[PDB]
C-alpha cells in the first residue's frame, strides 16, 4: 500500500508545539538509560521517529508530559525489539522477565536488576504522579496485561484470526496508551462515562484500527492479518490488503458515527458541566491520538 | 438445551451453605426485604451457587450464595416501573465503587452495608495485585448502571447493547471468584494467553445470549428481529445458534489447552492452575445452563 494513502477521517491531526523541547528531554532520558537504548543502533532508533510520534499522538500535553510520552514510546519500541532475538523464542525465560516487570507495576518487586526494570520503574513513578490509587489500579492491570502477553508471543515464534487479534490487542499496549490520555491531561474520567457503551466502543475501535493499518503497512517487510486473510480467503495479496484496510475504514467510520452521538449520550445521563467536559476531553483525546498516529504511520 | 460434552456438577455442601445464606439475609434484612419471600426463593440462589461453584468448601459456597443474592437484590432497586434518574443511579454506583477501592467514607445504605461485607470477605487471602483487577471489575459492573437506566427511557443498537450487557452481567467478577473460591491465583501469562482470554470471553457471553432467548425491548432477540426484518422464530434461532457456536468454540479451545501450556513450558504447579482455571469456567457454564433450564 502507498504511503500516500490514508484512512478517511472528518478531522485532521494536530502537532504539539513543545516537540523540540520534549525531544531534547527525551535525548537526556536515553542517556540515563543508555544500556536499554544500546540494544539497537542510533540509525534504527532515529528511523522510528519516536518524538514525532509522541507529538502527533498527544498534541495538547505540556513539554514535561510530552517528554514522558516520548520516553514511554521509546520504551515500548526498545522493549519489544529485545525479543526479536533467540531469547524471544524461549517463552519460559520471557515469562520470568515479564513477571518481574508486572511486579514493579504492582509495587512488589524486591530490587531492580536489569535495564528494562530500571527504565520501567522510572516511567511508572512518573506515570502515577498526581493520579488516584483507583486510577493506578486499572493502569497497573493494563501494564500487567501488556507484559503478560509476551510469553504467548514468544511461543508463537500461521494463527487463526481471533487468536491473532486477541494476542495483538495485548502486545499493542493500546489500553495503557489510552490510560495516558488521563495522566497527560491531568484529569480522570467519571466512571459512568468511561464504562458507558458508547465510550467503551470508541476506545475499542481506536485501539484496534492502528493494529489493522500497521499490518497492511508492514506486510511487505514481514503473524500478520493480511497473511491470514489471503490464506483464509484464497485471494490475491492486493485483495487481502484491501480487505484489511477496508475493515479499518469501517471501524473509523463507526468511531466517527459514535462521536456524533456523544452529546445525546451525555445528556441522557444528565452529566454536569465538569463531567461533560471530561467526557469530551477523553473522546477527543482518543480521536486526536488516532489521527496523529495515522499521519505518523504514513510518513514513518 | 445448550449442548456441552461434559455435564454439570453439584456442590455437596448445598444445605449447609443455604443455611449460612439465610443467616446473611437475616443480617441484611432491609436489603432482603425489598422483594417478596416467594419472589426471592423463586430464584433459588443457593441452587445456582451450588451448580456454578461445585468444588468450593461450605464456607466459600456460602460466600458465592451471598454474592449471587446481592446481585439480584441490588439490581432490584433499579427495576422501578419507569426507571430511576440516571444521575441518581450514578451517585449510588459511584459510592459502591468507592468501597471496592477503599475510599468510601461511611457505609450507609442497605446495598452499601451488604457490599462492604461481601468485598471484605472476597479480598481476604488474595494478593493486592489480584485485588486491583477484582476492584476494577466491580467498578465496571457498578459504572454501567447509569447507562442501563438511561436506556429504559428509549430497541437499542446491537453492538451497544452487547457492550452494555457484558458489564451489567458481572461475568468478569463472577470469573474472578473462581480464584478466590478455589484459593489460587493464575499465572499472569496463562490468564492473558490468547487461548485463555478467548475461553473467558466466550464463557462470559454465552449466558447473556441464552438468558435473552429465555426471557422473551433491551433484549438481543428483539434487536436481531428488527435489524434483519425477520420472524421471531428466525431471530431466536440466530441468537441461540450463536450461543451454541460460542460453546462449540469454547470446547475446541479447551481441547487445545495442553498444547498451549506446553508451548510456554509451564511447570507442574502453573499447569495445574491453568487447568483449575479452565475447568472452573467450564463447570460454571455447565452448572449455569442446567440451573437456567430448571
Coordinates of C-alpha atoms in Angstrom, one line a residue:
Chain A
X1 CA 0.0 0.0 0.0
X2 CA 1.2 3.5 -0.9
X3 CA 2.4 5.8 2.0
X4 CA 0.3 8.3 0.1
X5 CA -3.0 6.7 1.0
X6 CA -4.6 7.5 4.3
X7 CA -7.7 6.3 6.2
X8 CA -10.6 8.8 5.7
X9 CA -11.5 10.9 8.8
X10 CA -13.6 14.1 9.0
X11 CA -10.9 15.9 11.1
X12 CA -7.2 16.2 10.8
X13 CA -4.2 15.5 13.1
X14 CA -2.6 18.1 15.4
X15 CA 1.0 18.6 16.4
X16 CA 2.4 19.5 19.8
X17 CA 4.1 22.9 19.9
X18 CA 6.6 21.6 22.5
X19 CA 8.0 18.9 20.2
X20 CA 11.6 20.4 20.1
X21 CA 11.9 20.9 23.9
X22 CA 10.5 17.4 24.5
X23 CA 12.9 15.9 22.0
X24 CA 15.8 17.4 24.0
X25 CA 14.4 15.9 27.2
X26 CA 13.9 12.5 25.5
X27 CA 17.6 12.5 24.4
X28 CA 18.6 13.1 28.1
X29 CA 16.4 10.1 29.2
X30 CA 18.0 7.9 26.5
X31 CA 21.4 8.9 28.0
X32 CA 20.2 8.0 31.5
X33 CA 19.1 4.6 30.1
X34 CA 22.0 4.0 27.8
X35 CA 22.1 0.3 28.4
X36 CA 18.5 -0.1 27.4
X37 CA 18.8 2.1 24.3
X38 CA 22.1 0.4 23.1
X39 CA 20.1 -2.7 22.0
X40 CA 19.7 -1.1 18.6
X41 CA 21.8 1.3 16.5
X42 CA 21.4 5.1 16.6
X43 CA 20.2 4.8 13.0
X44 CA 17.5 2.3 13.8
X45 CA 16.3 4.3 16.7
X46 CA 16.2 7.6 14.8
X47 CA 14.4 5.8 12.0
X48 CA 11.5 5.2 14.4
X49 CA 10.9 8.9 14.8
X50 CA 9.7 8.5 18.3
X51 CA 9.4 12.2 19.3
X52 CA 7.4 12.9 16.1
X53 CA 5.0 10.0 17.1
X54 CA 4.6 11.4 20.7
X55 CA 4.0 14.9 19.4
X56 CA 1.3 13.9 17.0
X57 CA -0.5 11.5 19.3
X58 CA -0.6 13.7 22.5
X59 CA -0.6 17.2 20.8
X60 CA -2.1 19.0 23.8
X61 CA 0.3 17.9 26.5
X62 CA 2.8 20.2 28.3
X63 CA 6.5 20.0 27.4
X64 CA 7.2 17.8 30.5
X65 CA 4.3 15.5 29.8
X66 CA 5.2 15.2 26.1
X67 CA 8.7 14.2 27.1
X68 CA 7.1 11.4 29.3
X69 CA 5.1 10.3 26.3
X70 CA 8.3 10.2 24.2
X71 CA 10.2 8.2 26.9
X72 CA 7.3 5.8 27.1
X73 CA 7.1 5.2 23.3
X74 CA 10.8 4.7 23.2
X75 CA 10.5 2.1 26.0
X76 CA 7.8 0.2 24.0
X77 CA 9.9 0.1 20.8
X78 CA 13.1 -0.9 22.7
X79 CA 11.4 -3.4 25.0
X80 CA 9.9 -5.4 22.2
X81 CA 12.9 -5.2 20.0
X82 CA 14.8 -7.0 22.8
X83 CA 12.6 -10.1 21.8
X84 CA 13.4 -10.0 18.1
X85 CA 16.1 -12.5 19.1
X86 CA 16.8 -16.1 20.2
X87 CA 15.6 -15.0 23.7
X88 CA 12.3 -14.2 22.0
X89 CA 11.9 -17.9 21.2
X90 CA 12.3 -19.0 24.8
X91 CA 8.8 -18.5 26.4
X92 CA 9.8 -19.5 30.0
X93 CA 12.7 -17.0 30.0
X94 CA 10.3 -14.4 28.7
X95 CA 7.8 -15.3 31.4
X96 CA 10.4 -14.7 34.2
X97 CA 11.3 -11.3 32.8
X98 CA 7.7 -10.2 32.3
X99 CA 6.6 -11.4 35.7
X100 CA 9.2 -9.1 37.4
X101 CA 8.1 -6.1 35.3
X102 CA 4.5 -6.6 36.4
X103 CA 5.7 -6.8 40.0
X104 CA 7.1 -3.3 39.5
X105 CA 3.6 -2.0 38.4
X106 CA 2.0 -3.6 41.5
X107 CA 4.8 -2.4 43.9
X108 CA 6.1 -5.9 44.9
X109 CA 9.5 -6.1 43.2
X110 CA 12.2 -6.5 45.7
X111 CA 15.1 -5.0 43.7
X112 CA 15.6 -3.8 40.2
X113 CA 18.2 -5.8 38.4
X114 CA 18.0 -5.1 34.6
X115 CA 18.0 -2.1 32.3
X116 CA 14.3 -2.8 31.4
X117 CA 13.3 -3.0 35.0
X118 CA 15.1 0.2 35.8
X119 CA 13.6 2.1 32.8
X120 CA 10.1 0.8 33.6
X121 CA 10.4 1.7 37.3
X122 CA 11.4 5.3 36.3
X123 CA 8.5 5.6 33.9
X124 CA 5.9 4.0 36.3
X125 CA 7.0 6.5 39.0
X126 CA 6.3 9.4 36.6
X127 CA 3.1 7.9 35.2
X128 CA 1.5 7.5 38.6
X129 CA 2.3 11.1 39.8
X130 CA -0.8 13.0 40.7
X131 CA -3.2 10.1 39.8
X132 CA -5.6 8.5 42.3
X133 CA -4.8 5.0 43.7
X134 CA -8.1 4.0 42.0
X135 CA -6.8 5.1 38.5
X136 CA -3.5 3.4 39.4
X137 CA -5.2 0.1 39.9
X138 CA -6.5 0.0 36.4
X139 CA -3.3 1.4 34.9
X140 CA -1.3 -1.3 36.8
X141 CA -3.6 -4.0 35.5
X142 CA -3.2 -2.8 31.9
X143 CA 0.6 -2.8 32.3
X144 CA 0.3 -6.4 33.6
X145 CA -1.9 -7.3 30.6
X146 CA 0.9 -6.0 28.2
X147 CA 3.8 -7.7 29.9
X148 CA 1.8 -11.0 30.4
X149 CA 1.1 -11.4 26.7
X150 CA 4.7 -11.7 25.8
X151 CA 5.3 -15.4 26.6
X152 CA 2.4 -16.3 24.3
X153 CA 4.0 -14.2 21.6
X154 CA 7.3 -16.0 22.1
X155 CA 5.6 -19.4 21.9
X156 CA 4.0 -18.3 18.6
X157 CA 7.7 -17.8 17.5
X158 CA 0.1 -19.1 11.0
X159 CA -2.6 -18.4 13.6
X160 CA -6.4 -18.1 13.3
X161 CA -7.8 -14.6 13.1
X162 CA -9.4 -14.5 16.5
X163 CA -6.3 -15.8 18.3
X164 CA -4.1 -13.4 16.4
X165 CA -6.2 -10.3 17.2
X166 CA -6.6 -11.4 20.8
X167 CA -2.8 -11.5 21.2
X168 CA -2.3 -8.3 19.2
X169 CA -4.6 -6.3 21.4
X170 CA -2.3 -7.1 24.4
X171 CA 1.0 -6.6 22.7
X172 CA -0.1 -3.3 21.1
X173 CA -0.4 -1.7 24.6
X174 CA -3.3 0.5 23.5
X175 CA -5.1 0.2 26.8
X176 CA -2.1 1.8 28.6
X177 CA -1.6 4.3 25.7
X178 CA -5.2 5.4 26.3
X179 CA -4.8 5.4 30.1
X180 CA -2.2 8.0 29.4
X181 CA -4.8 10.4 28.0
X182 CA -5.9 11.0 31.6
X183 CA -2.4 11.2 33.1
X184 CA -1.1 13.6 30.3
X185 CA -4.3 15.6 30.5
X186 CA -4.3 15.7 34.3
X187 CA -7.9 14.5 34.7
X188 CA -9.8 11.3 35.5
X189 CA -13.0 10.4 33.6
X190 CA -16.2 9.8 35.6
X191 CA -16.7 6.0 35.9
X192 CA -20.2 6.1 34.3
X193 CA -18.7 7.9 31.2
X194 CA -15.7 5.5 31.0
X195 CA -18.0 2.5 31.0
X196 CA -20.9 3.9 29.0
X197 CA -21.2 1.6 26.0
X198 CA -20.7 4.5 23.5
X199 CA -17.4 5.3 25.1
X200 CA -16.3 1.6 25.6
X201 CA -16.8 1.2 21.8
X202 CA -14.9 4.4 21.0
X203 CA -12.0 3.1 23.0
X204 CA -12.0 -0.4 21.4
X205 CA -12.3 0.9 17.8
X206 CA -9.5 3.4 18.3
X207 CA -7.4 0.7 19.9
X208 CA -8.0 -1.8 17.0
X209 CA -7.6 0.5 14.0
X210 CA -3.8 1.0 14.3
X211 CA -3.2 -2.7 14.5
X212 CA -5.0 -3.2 11.2
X213 CA -3.3 -0.4 9.4
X214 CA 0.1 -1.4 10.8
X215 CA -0.3 -4.9 9.4
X216 CA -1.0 -3.6 6.0
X217 CA 1.9 -1.2 6.1
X218 CA 4.3 -3.9 7.4
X219 CA 3.2 -6.8 5.3
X220 CA 5.9 -6.4 2.7
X221 CA 8.7 -6.5 5.3
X222 CA 7.2 -9.3 7.3
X223 CA 1.8 -13.4 12.1
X224 CA 0.0 -10.6 10.1
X225 CA -3.7 -10.2 9.4
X226 CA -3.1 -9.6 5.7
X227 CA -1.4 -13.1 5.5
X228 CA -4.3 -14.6 7.5
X229 CA -6.9 -13.2 5.2
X230 CA -5.0 -14.1 2.0
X231 CA -4.8 -17.7 3.2
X232 CA -8.3 -18.0 4.6
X233 CA -10.0 -16.5 1.5
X234 CA -7.5 -17.9 -1.0
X235 CA -7.4 -14.5 -2.6
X236 CA -4.7 -12.2 -4.1
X237 CA -2.3 -10.3 -1.9
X238 CA -3.6 -7.0 -3.0
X239 CA -7.2 -8.2 -2.4
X240 CA -6.1 -9.2 1.1
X241 CA -4.6 -5.8 1.8
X242 CA -7.8 -4.1 0.7
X243 CA -9.9 -6.4 2.9
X244 CA -7.9 -5.4 6.0
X245 CA -7.6 -1.7 5.1
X246 CA -11.4 -1.5 4.4
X247 CA -12.2 -3.1 7.8
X248 CA -10.0 -0.4 9.4
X249 CA -12.0 2.2 7.4
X250 CA -15.3 0.7 8.6
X251 CA -14.1 0.9 12.1
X252 CA -13.0 4.5 11.6
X253 CA -16.5 5.4 10.2
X254 CA -18.2 3.7 13.2
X255 CA -15.9 5.6 15.6
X256 CA -16.9 8.9 14.0
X257 CA -20.6 8.0 14.0
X258 CA -20.4 7.3 17.7
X259 CA -18.5 10.5 18.3
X260 CA -21.5 12.3 16.6
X261 CA -23.8 10.6 19.1
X262 CA -21.8 11.7 22.2
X263 CA -23.8 14.8 23.1
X264 CA -27.1 12.8 23.1
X265 CA -25.4 10.1 25.2
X266 CA -24.1 12.6 27.8
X267 CA -27.5 14.4 28.0
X268 CA -29.2 11.1 28.5
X269 CA -27.3 10.7 31.8
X270 CA -27.7 14.3 32.9
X271 CA -24.0 14.9 33.2
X272 CA -23.0 18.1 35.0
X273 CA -20.7 20.6 33.0
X274 CA -17.4 19.3 34.5
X275 CA -18.4 15.7 33.8
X276 CA -19.4 16.7 30.2
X277 CA -16.1 18.4 29.7
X278 CA -14.2 15.3 30.9
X279 CA -16.2 13.2 28.6
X280 CA -15.3 15.4 25.6
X281 CA -11.6 15.6 26.6
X282 CA -11.5 11.8 26.7
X283 CA -13.3 11.2 23.4
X284 CA -11.3 14.0 21.7
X285 CA -8.1 12.6 23.1
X286 CA -8.7 9.2 21.5
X287 CA -9.8 10.9 18.2
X288 CA -6.6 13.1 18.1
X289 CA -4.4 10.0 19.1
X290 CA -5.9 8.1 16.1
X291 CA -5.5 11.0 13.6
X292 CA -1.9 11.7 14.7
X293 CA -0.9 8.0 14.7
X294 CA -2.2 7.6 11.2
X295 CA -0.2 10.7 10.0
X296 CA 3.0 9.3 11.7
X297 CA 2.4 5.9 10.2
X298 CA 2.2 7.1 6.6
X299 CA 5.5 9.1 7.0
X300 CA 7.4 6.8 9.3
Chain B
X1 CA -30.8 -27.1 25.9
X2 CA -27.4 -25.7 25.2
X3 CA -25.1 -28.6 24.3
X4 CA -21.8 -29.4 26.1
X5 CA -19.6 -32.5 26.0
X6 CA -19.4 -32.6 29.8
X7 CA -22.2 -32.4 32.5
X8 CA -22.7 -30.1 35.4
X9 CA -21.7 -30.9 38.9
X10 CA -23.4 -30.0 42.2
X11 CA -21.8 -28.9 45.5
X12 CA -22.3 -31.5 48.3
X13 CA -22.4 -28.6 50.8
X14 CA -25.6 -27.0 49.4
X15 CA -27.8 -27.5 52.5
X16 CA -25.1 -26.1 54.9
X17 CA -24.4 -23.1 52.6
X18 CA -28.1 -22.4 52.2
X19 CA -28.5 -22.1 56.0
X20 CA -25.5 -19.8 56.2
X21 CA -27.0 -17.8 53.3
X22 CA -30.3 -17.4 55.2
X23 CA -28.3 -16.0 58.2
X24 CA -26.8 -13.5 55.9
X25 CA -30.2 -12.4 54.6
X26 CA -31.3 -12.1 58.2
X27 CA -28.4 -9.7 58.9
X28 CA -29.2 -7.7 55.7
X29 CA -32.9 -7.6 56.3
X30 CA -33.5 -4.2 54.8
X31 CA -31.9 -5.1 51.5
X32 CA -33.6 -8.5 51.5
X33 CA -37.0 -7.1 52.4
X34 CA -37.0 -5.2 49.1
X35 CA -38.6 -8.1 47.4
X36 CA -41.3 -10.7 48.5
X37 CA -40.3 -14.0 50.0
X38 CA -41.8 -16.1 47.2
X39 CA -40.0 -14.0 44.6
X40 CA -36.6 -14.5 46.2
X41 CA -37.0 -18.2 46.8
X42 CA -38.3 -18.5 43.3
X43 CA -34.8 -17.5 42.2
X44 CA -33.3 -20.2 44.3
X45 CA -30.0 -18.6 44.7
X46 CA -28.2 -21.3 46.6
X47 CA -29.1 -23.8 44.0
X48 CA -27.4 -21.6 41.4
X49 CA -24.3 -21.2 43.6
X50 CA -24.1 -24.9 44.2
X51 CA -24.1 -25.7 40.5
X52 CA -21.7 -23.0 39.2
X53 CA -19.0 -23.4 42.0
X54 CA -19.5 -27.1 42.8
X55 CA -15.9 -27.7 44.1
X56 CA -16.0 -25.0 46.8
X57 CA -16.0 -25.6 50.6
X58 CA -19.1 -24.9 52.6
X59 CA -17.8 -21.6 53.8
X60 CA -16.9 -20.5 50.3
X61 CA -20.2 -21.8 48.8
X62 CA -22.0 -19.6 51.3
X63 CA -19.9 -16.6 50.1
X64 CA -21.0 -17.4 46.5
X65 CA -24.6 -17.6 47.5
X66 CA -24.4 -14.3 49.4
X67 CA -22.8 -12.7 46.3
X68 CA -25.4 -14.0 43.9
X69 CA -28.2 -12.9 46.3
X70 CA -26.6 -9.5 46.4
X71 CA -26.6 -9.2 42.6
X72 CA -30.3 -9.9 42.4
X73 CA -31.3 -7.7 45.4
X74 CA -29.0 -4.8 44.4
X75 CA -30.4 -4.7 40.9
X76 CA -34.0 -4.9 42.0
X77 CA -33.8 -1.3 43.2
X78 CA -33.4 0.0 39.6
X79 CA -36.3 -2.1 38.4
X80 CA -38.8 0.6 39.1
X81 CA -41.8 0.9 36.8
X82 CA -40.4 3.9 34.9
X83 CA -36.7 3.6 35.7
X84 CA -34.5 5.7 38.1
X85 CA -33.0 9.1 37.1
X86 CA -29.6 8.1 35.6
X87 CA -27.7 10.8 37.6
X88 CA -29.2 9.4 40.8
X89 CA -28.1 5.9 39.8
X90 CA -24.6 7.4 39.1
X91 CA -24.4 8.8 42.6
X92 CA -25.4 5.4 44.2
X93 CA -23.0 3.5 42.0
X94 CA -20.0 5.8 42.5
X95 CA -20.3 5.3 46.3
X96 CA -20.3 1.5 45.8
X97 CA -17.2 1.6 43.5
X98 CA -15.5 3.7 46.2
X99 CA -16.0 0.8 48.7
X100 CA -14.2 -1.6 46.3
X101 CA -11.3 0.9 46.1
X102 CA -11.2 1.5 49.8
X103 CA -12.3 5.2 49.5
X104 CA -15.9 5.4 50.8
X105 CA -16.2 7.5 53.9
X106 CA -19.1 5.8 55.5
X107 CA -21.1 2.8 54.6
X108 CA -24.7 3.9 55.0
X109 CA -27.4 2.3 52.7
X110 CA -28.5 -1.3 52.8
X111 CA -26.7 -2.0 49.5
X112 CA -23.5 -0.4 50.9
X113 CA -23.6 -2.4 54.1
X114 CA -24.1 -5.6 52.2
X115 CA -21.4 -4.9 49.6
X116 CA -18.8 -3.9 52.3
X117 CA -19.3 -7.2 54.0
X118 CA -19.0 -9.1 50.7
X119 CA -16.0 -7.2 49.5
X120 CA -14.1 -7.8 52.8
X121 CA -14.8 -11.5 52.5
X122 CA -13.8 -11.6 48.8
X123 CA -10.4 -9.9 49.4
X124 CA -9.3 -12.0 52.4
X125 CA -6.4 -14.3 51.4
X126 CA -5.9 -12.7 47.9
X127 CA -2.9 -10.6 46.8
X128 CA -3.2 -6.8 46.5
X129 CA -2.4 -7.5 42.8
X130 CA -5.4 -9.7 42.4
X131 CA -7.5 -7.2 44.3
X132 CA -6.6 -4.4 41.8
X133 CA -8.2 -6.4 38.9
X134 CA -11.1 -7.6 41.1
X135 CA -11.8 -3.9 42.2
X136 CA -11.7 -2.7 38.7
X137 CA -14.2 -5.3 37.6
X138 CA -16.6 -4.4 40.4
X139 CA -16.2 -0.7 39.3
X140 CA -17.0 -1.8 35.7
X141 CA -20.3 -3.5 36.9
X142 CA -21.4 -0.6 39.1
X143 CA -20.4 2.0 36.5
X144 CA -22.6 0.5 33.7
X145 CA -25.8 1.1 35.6
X146 CA -26.4 4.8 34.8
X147 CA -26.2 3.9 31.0
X148 CA -28.7 1.0 31.7
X149 CA -31.1 3.4 33.4
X150 CA -30.9 5.9 30.6
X151 CA -31.7 3.1 28.1
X152 CA -35.0 2.5 29.9
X153 CA -36.3 5.8 28.5
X154 CA -35.6 4.8 24.9
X155 CA -34.7 -1.5 20.7
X156 CA -31.1 -0.3 21.1
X157 CA -28.2 -0.8 18.7
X158 CA -26.8 -4.4 18.7
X159 CA -23.1 -3.6 19.4
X160 CA -24.0 -1.1 22.0
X161 CA -26.5 -3.5 23.7
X162 CA -23.8 -6.3 23.9
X163 CA -21.2 -3.8 25.2
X164 CA -23.6 -2.8 28.0
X165 CA -24.7 -6.3 28.8
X166 CA -21.1 -7.5 29.3
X167 CA -20.9 -5.0 32.1
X168 CA -24.3 -5.5 33.8
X169 CA -24.0 -9.3 33.7
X170 CA -21.0 -9.1 36.1
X171 CA -19.4 -12.1 34.5
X172 CA -15.9 -10.7 34.9
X173 CA -16.3 -10.6 38.7
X174 CA -18.1 -13.9 38.7
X175 CA -15.0 -15.4 37.0
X176 CA -12.6 -13.5 39.4
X177 CA -14.4 -15.6 42.0
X178 CA -13.0 -18.9 40.5
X179 CA -9.7 -17.8 42.0
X180 CA -11.0 -16.6 45.4
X181 CA -13.3 -19.6 46.0
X182 CA -10.5 -22.0 44.8
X183 CA -7.8 -20.3 46.9
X184 CA -5.4 -19.9 44.0
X185 CA -4.2 -17.2 41.6
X186 CA -3.5 -18.0 38.0
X187 CA -0.1 -17.2 36.5
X188 CA -0.2 -14.0 34.5
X189 CA 1.0 -15.5 31.2
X190 CA -1.8 -18.1 31.4
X191 CA -4.5 -15.6 32.3
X192 CA -3.5 -13.4 29.3
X193 CA -2.6 -16.1 26.8
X194 CA -5.0 -15.6 23.8
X195 CA -6.4 -19.1 24.3
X196 CA -7.4 -18.4 27.9
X197 CA -8.6 -14.8 27.1
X198 CA -11.0 -16.3 24.5
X199 CA -12.2 -19.1 26.8
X200 CA -13.1 -16.4 29.4
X201 CA -14.9 -14.1 26.9
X202 CA -16.8 -17.0 25.3
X203 CA -17.9 -18.3 28.7
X204 CA -18.9 -14.8 29.8
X205 CA -21.0 -14.2 26.7
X206 CA -22.9 -17.5 26.4
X207 CA -25.1 -17.0 29.5
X208 CA -26.1 -13.5 28.3
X209 CA -27.3 -14.9 25.0
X210 CA -29.2 -17.9 26.4
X211 CA -30.8 -15.7 29.1
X212 CA -32.1 -13.2 26.5
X213 CA -33.7 -16.1 24.5
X214 CA -35.3 -17.4 27.6
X215 CA -36.7 -14.1 28.7
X216 CA -39.0 -13.5 25.6
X217 CA -37.0 -4.1 24.3
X218 CA -33.4 -4.2 25.6
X219 CA -33.1 -7.9 24.5
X220 CA -30.9 -9.4 21.8
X221 CA -33.8 -11.3 20.2
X222 CA -35.8 -8.0 19.7
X223 CA -32.7 -6.3 18.2
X224 CA -31.9 -9.1 15.7
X225 CA -35.5 -9.4 14.6
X226 CA -35.7 -5.6 14.0
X227 CA -32.3 -5.5 12.2
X228 CA -32.9 -8.5 9.9
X229 CA -36.6 -7.7 9.4
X230 CA -37.2 -11.4 10.2
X231 CA -39.6 -13.6 12.1
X232 CA -39.5 -14.1 15.9
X233 CA -38.5 -17.7 15.3
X234 CA -35.7 -16.8 12.9
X235 CA -34.4 -14.2 15.5
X236 CA -34.5 -16.6 18.4
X237 CA -32.6 -19.2 16.3
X238 CA -30.0 -16.6 15.3
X239 CA -29.3 -15.9 19.0
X240 CA -29.5 -19.4 20.2
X241 CA -27.3 -20.7 17.4
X242 CA -24.7 -18.0 18.1
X243 CA -24.6 -19.2 21.7
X244 CA -24.1 -22.8 20.6
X245 CA -21.3 -21.7 18.2
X246 CA -19.6 -19.9 21.0
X247 CA -20.0 -23.1 23.3
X248 CA -18.5 -25.2 20.4
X249 CA -15.6 -22.8 20.1
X250 CA -15.1 -22.8 23.9
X251 CA -14.7 -26.6 23.9
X252 CA -12.4 -26.6 20.8
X253 CA -10.1 -24.2 22.7
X254 CA -10.3 -26.3 25.8
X255 CA -9.1 -29.3 23.7
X256 CA -6.1 -27.1 22.7
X257 CA -5.1 -26.2 26.3
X258 CA -2.4 -28.9 26.8
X259 CA -0.5 -27.8 23.7
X260 CA -0.8 -24.2 24.7
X261 CA 0.6 -24.8 28.2
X262 CA 3.5 -27.0 26.8
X263 CA 4.3 -24.2 24.3
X264 CA 5.1 -22.0 27.2
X265 CA 7.0 -24.7 29.2
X266 CA 4.8 -24.2 32.3
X267 CA 5.9 -26.0 35.4
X268 CA 3.5 -28.5 37.1
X269 CA 2.1 -26.0 39.5
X270 CA 1.4 -23.5 36.8
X271 CA -0.1 -26.2 34.6
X272 CA -2.4 -27.3 37.4
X273 CA -3.5 -23.6 38.0
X274 CA -4.2 -23.3 34.2
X275 CA -6.4 -26.5 34.4
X276 CA -8.2 -25.4 37.5
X277 CA -9.0 -22.0 35.8
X278 CA -10.3 -23.6 32.6
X279 CA -12.2 -26.3 34.5
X280 CA -13.7 -23.6 36.7
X281 CA -15.1 -21.7 33.7
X282 CA -16.3 -25.0 32.1
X283 CA -18.1 -26.1 35.2
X284 CA -19.6 -22.6 35.7
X285 CA -21.1 -22.8 32.2
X286 CA -22.5 -26.3 32.6
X287 CA -23.9 -25.5 36.0
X288 CA -25.5 -22.2 35.0
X289 CA -27.1 -23.7 31.9
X290 CA -28.6 -26.5 34.0
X291 CA -29.9 -24.0 36.5
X292 CA -31.4 -21.8 33.7
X293 CA -33.3 -24.6 32.1
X294 CA -34.6 -25.7 35.6

